[PDB]
Inverse folding.
């Protein structure tokens, strides 16, 4: 997961970012 | 901006993260 700007997402989250990141997941 | 997985997206980009983080943009 991670925390951004006062909210967090859990382990195993993925999200679509602009390129060059594209689809990324957040193991912690 | 936002850096992850050896890449960065530029200032002024956004992404949809799961609740509760939701829709966020990346000032730097």
């Amino acid at each position: 997961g991670f925390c951004w700007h006062h909210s967090c997402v859990p382990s195993g989250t993925c999200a679509d970012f602009p390129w060059p990141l594209g689809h990324q997941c957040f193991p912690d």
Observations:
- Chain B touches chain A at residues 2, 4-5, 7-10, 13, 15-18, 20-22, 24 (CB under 8 Å).
